[PDB]
Each structure stands twice: as structure tokens, then as C-alpha cells.
Write a protein that binds this ligand. Sequence first.
Ligand SMILES: [Hg+2]
Ligand SMILES: [Hg+2]
Ligand SMILES: [Hg+2]
Ligand SMILES: [Hg+2]
Length: 262
Amino acid sequence: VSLPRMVYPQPKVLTPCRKDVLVVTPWLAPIVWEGTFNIDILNEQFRLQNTTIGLTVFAIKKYVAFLKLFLETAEKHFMVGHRVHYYVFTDQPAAVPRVTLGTGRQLSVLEVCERRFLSEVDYLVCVDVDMEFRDHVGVEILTPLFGTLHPSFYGSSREAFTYERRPQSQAYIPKDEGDFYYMGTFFGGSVQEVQRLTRACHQAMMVDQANGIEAVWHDESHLNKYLLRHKPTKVLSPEYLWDQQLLGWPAVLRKLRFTAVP
Ligand SMILES: [Hg+2]
Ligand SMILES: [Hg+2]
Ligand SMILES: [Hg+2]
Ligand SMILES: [Hg+2]
């Protein structure tokens, strides 16, 4: 469908969008920083497709305590105006707080890549519960396949990346390979691409088990190997995954959108 008439500043062909950061990968995937996107344009494009976003979180044992703040802040900041289905995976279904949701937003509690996700959402976003949203996280992230730059490693050279370095692991990446170091959380994409990813990692991890080896950073090591060989269609800047107690608030981050809880 066509967009309506809209009034916004003209893009400036001869002005770089940012002079401080890389805003596109060498496979031409956007890297999402504040200033790169017009949110009104993007909201129109996604609303016109009647987009549903699923948000999955695991909350097991003590981690259930974090659900209240997680959901309440997602309600303020996550995909506001779009259809959202939260999927909470928990060992304690009765301890899930009753959080009031906006219209068009729903929550399922699943007691601990089901096909149920295909018929229900267009995109899946996979995060941890011990976080809170502090600023806009919206449709600018949505794409067939995305990962987020680990906040501790975005300025690192590939040699310093904590990839799995042992050739006997399926997650092995040598010193002369690697684009970015993606954090093993906050990834997502179309349901198809997310299921392909989780299926690949799950098979690689079982191969490692049979061979008596466990990757240095577990799930995250294997995510890094997957996204090296299957380039994400967007990459999110560390605005999308921050720890301000550990890392402060550098000038390169104009927004801190989704952050560790004390
Ligand atoms: Hg710009
Ligand atoms: Hg997921
Ligand atoms: Hg896995
Ligand atoms: Hg993975």
C-alpha cells in the first residue's frame, strides 16, 4: 500500500547522518543509532502491514521478580501503537505479575521455536527479563534478521572479541574473522529467521556436547558464529542493550533504550 502525504525534513544527500559512528555494514545492512531513522515514516510502513511483534522472555527461579518492571516499562517504550504479544516462559506461572496492558497488546504465560509463533506474530524479539526499557524501542529494529552489538565490545578489534577460539567447537571463529561481537540476547527477526537461528545453535551445541566441549560463552558463542556466516539484515547499536552502572553514558549514545537493572 502507498504511504499518505507526510511532512518531515528533507534527507540531506550531502550531509552524513552521523560523523562519529558506522551506520551501515559492508553487506549494506543498516546499523540502528538515534538520528538514522525517521520514526513516523517507519511507523506508517509497519502499521499499514498490520504488523504483530512477539516479545519472548525466560523468567526462571529468582528471575520472576524482574517481570513487573520489565513488562511495565515494555508497556511504556516497546512497539507502542503496534500489536504486541509477550510470551513469558517461566517455571512459576502463578508468580507472573498482573500487569495492565494497552489495547492490542497481549500476554501468554508458557510453563517450562513452536509453530504457534508462525500463526501468531510477524516478528520475534528475544530478550532477558532482568532489564528495563528506558526509551523508545520500536519498529526501526524490525527486519528478517538482527543482532545487537555487545555494549562491552562495540569499540573492540576482532582479535579482542571473546569468540570461541578452540577449533574443536562448532562455535570456533579464528583471529582473522569476525564483524562484530553480538550479545547473546536481544536478537530477533521474522519468525522463520529466528527459528532457523535457534535450530542451528541448538544443533551446534549438541554437537559440542557429544564432543565433550562447551563454548566459552555458551549460547552467545554460537550466536556469534551463526551471525558471522548468516549476516543480519540490521544490526542494533548498544543503545538497545546497555549497562549504565558498568559503562556510564558515553557521548556516542544519544539514547539509552533498554538497560540492565541494578
Ligand atoms: Hg541522519
Ligand atoms: Hg525467541
Ligand atoms: Hg542454543
Ligand atoms: Hg543462538
